[PDB]
Amino acid sequence: AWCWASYLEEEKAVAVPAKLFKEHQSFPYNKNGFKVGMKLEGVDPEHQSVYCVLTVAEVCGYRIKLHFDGYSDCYDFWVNADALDIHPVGWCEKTGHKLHPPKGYKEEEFNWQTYLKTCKAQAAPKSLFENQNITVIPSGFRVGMKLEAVDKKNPSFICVATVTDMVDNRFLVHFDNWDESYDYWCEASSPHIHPVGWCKEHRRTLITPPGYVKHFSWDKYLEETNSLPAPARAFKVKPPHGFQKKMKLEVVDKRNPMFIRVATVADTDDHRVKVHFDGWNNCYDYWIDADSPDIHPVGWCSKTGHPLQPPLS
Amino acid sequence: AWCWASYLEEEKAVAVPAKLFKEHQSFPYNKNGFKVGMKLEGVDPEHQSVYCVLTVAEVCGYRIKLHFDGYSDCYDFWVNADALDIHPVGWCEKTGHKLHPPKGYKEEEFNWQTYLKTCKAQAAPKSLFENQNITVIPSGFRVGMKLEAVDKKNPSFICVATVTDMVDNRFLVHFDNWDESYDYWCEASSPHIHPVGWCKEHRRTLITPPGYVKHFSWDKYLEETNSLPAPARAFKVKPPHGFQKKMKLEVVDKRNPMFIRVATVADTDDHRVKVHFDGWNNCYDYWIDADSPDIHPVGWCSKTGHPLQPPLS
Numbered sequence A, B: 001a002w003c004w005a006s007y008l009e010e011e012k013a014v015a016v017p018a019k020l021f022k023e024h025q026s027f028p029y030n031k032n033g034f035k036v037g038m039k040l041e042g043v044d045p046e047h048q049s050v051y052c053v054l055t056v057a058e059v060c061g062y063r064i065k066l067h068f069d070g071y072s073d074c075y076d077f078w079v080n081a082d083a084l085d086i087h088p089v090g091w092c093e094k095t096g097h098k099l100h101p102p103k104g105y106k107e108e109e110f111n112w113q114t115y116l117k118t119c120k121a122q123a124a125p126k127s128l129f130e131n132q133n134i135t136v137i138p139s140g141f142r143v144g145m146k147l148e149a150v151d152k153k154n155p156s157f158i159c160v161a162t163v164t165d166m167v168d169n170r171f172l173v174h175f176d177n178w179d180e181s182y183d184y185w186c187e188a189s190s191p192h193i194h195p196v197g198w199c200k201e202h203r204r205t206l207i208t209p210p211g212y213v214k215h216f217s218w219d220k221y222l223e224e225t226n227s228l229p230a231p232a233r234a235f236k237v238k239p240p241h242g243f244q245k246k247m248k249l250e251v252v253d254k255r256n257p258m259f260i261r262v263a264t265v266a267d268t269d270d271h272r273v274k275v276h277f278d279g280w281n282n283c284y285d286y287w288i289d290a291d292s293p294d295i296h297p298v299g300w301c302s303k304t305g306h307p308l309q310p311p312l313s
């Protein structure tokens, strides 16, 4: 019978200290009020500019598995009870964002009120959303501003981007003249964004928009698109995460995300940790942002009622 | 007879745009009120924690050559009329900083009033100091806070440092357990400073203080020295400078600093430009911070009454 106490002893090891985990990573303040069958609205994680109709398909401790109504279960995904890119039924209508209805339906005709009755289902209550009354820190970022952004789907490339929306303390990065498939949400301290002129001065090759870098001028482009660059003072410095090699923690199995496993910090860089699942081969290691809501301190699973997968026997 | 107009034409070249130069680099707002013989107080540029008695030895356009009273002329140095690390007679006494008197004198016995009469000289008036009433931007930096700083004298090395003083919007970086010879003044956006934990996560080797990195803990050290780390949010992002290769500008000859020469941006990095003096061999090129008060737009010398050395014949 395995426990963290004796495991730390035998292994002569140490946990990543609790104080290094941020609010969404650490022990939650409250219970998981979500119930299977509850419906809500959510950003499609692979199409981050798109809002979708979602149902809680499963609940596990402080986490929920969400399902795209009327679509295949292969798209299902797990987030914690306090996730940021989920909203209550009605939020899209309230804020004027476009809501993708379930499969078979027309966007115009969809009507939550009738849909909830048909499905004999309740919407998750508004109290559950940790994002209903977020304290808005002042920011230099505004919709329309341009900048230089890593393509998260191809992180080798830095590209011309624009802020196309803002919600609470987050904003949506969109790559000019590309499909919205590559959009992503981040904040002002993101290590994946830089002011215009960054690439040139760091000897990196800026990917310019399709239909247009050996000539490209930011100035000409800003002028022709009647746009402003995000001011440099708007960007913030990402605090060092302080995670060290060999420290222990609990982390979601990216590949079988129903599980959380005992893990070790194998490696570290300026904004990522390389996680190793104890007892597994090293080819199951992987890199994840050190601020990720899917890594947690020792004890998280216990305190929140989620099973911890012990080290592979 | 050489002029910038015809030189730009013949060379088929372009000036660095005026708008890229910062306030201390660009055309000044007022004349140079300094006069030879005027006395003042100044930071010793090679010992930046030390204040010294200085005399204006020469005036050229908007610049002044300053002399350390009673010491060798080899120490003389040039700054612009609006320099930051010069202060009026009496400033050290006003602010409680230690003033190094001229050679031969005792620090305690030195007395500006009697010294000015003996030398039959006037102190530069307080109006001349662009630093007398500087608008103080709010900052997270406070005296005592620790951080990681490049050694500017050996910029290969990042080392453990502390903020040991603050004046207007600048602060003094001091390397723990080293001589003060390595101190230097900077601001919150300096590319030479980073929060604690930076080095470890960027695969750099932090130089720890003498008398103490394969074991070093920032936490233990902060605790034992009863000190706080400068918060990450206090650091700011250095705006890209926008200087491009082949662009023309005017710049001080670092090696014979009485002269300002026609120059070309030869190379660029994240915070520096490599200047080339037109007509000279490439072995006279050198690197300088792109925010340096010694590089200026085409026309600076004309408008301020400083001679421009044309391209070497």
Ligand SMILES: [Co+2]
Residues within 6 Å of the ligand: A100
């Ligand atoms: Co569709």
Ligand SMILES: [Co+2]
Residues within 6 Å of the ligand: A174, A175, A176, A177, A178
């Ligand atoms: Co577009």
Ligand SMILES: [Co+2]
Residues within 6 Å of the ligand: A046, A181
């Ligand atoms: Co797709």
Ligand SMILES: [Co+2]
Residues within 6 Å of the ligand: A155, A191, A192, A271
């Ligand atoms: Co990254």
Ligand SMILES: [Co+2]
Residues within 6 Å of the ligand: A270
């Ligand atoms: Co970094």
Ligand SMILES: [Co+2]
Residues within 6 Å of the ligand: B100
């Ligand atoms: Co002395």
Ligand SMILES: [Co+2]
Residues within 6 Å of the ligand: B174, B175, B176, B177, B178
């Ligand atoms: Co010291």
Ligand SMILES: [Co+2]
Residues within 6 Å of the ligand: B046, B181
């Ligand atoms: Co010395």
Ligand SMILES: [Co+2]
Residues within 6 Å of the ligand: B155, B191, B192, B271
């Ligand atoms: Co440097």
Ligand SMILES: [Co+2]
Residues within 6 Å of the ligand: B270
């Ligand atoms: Co940089």
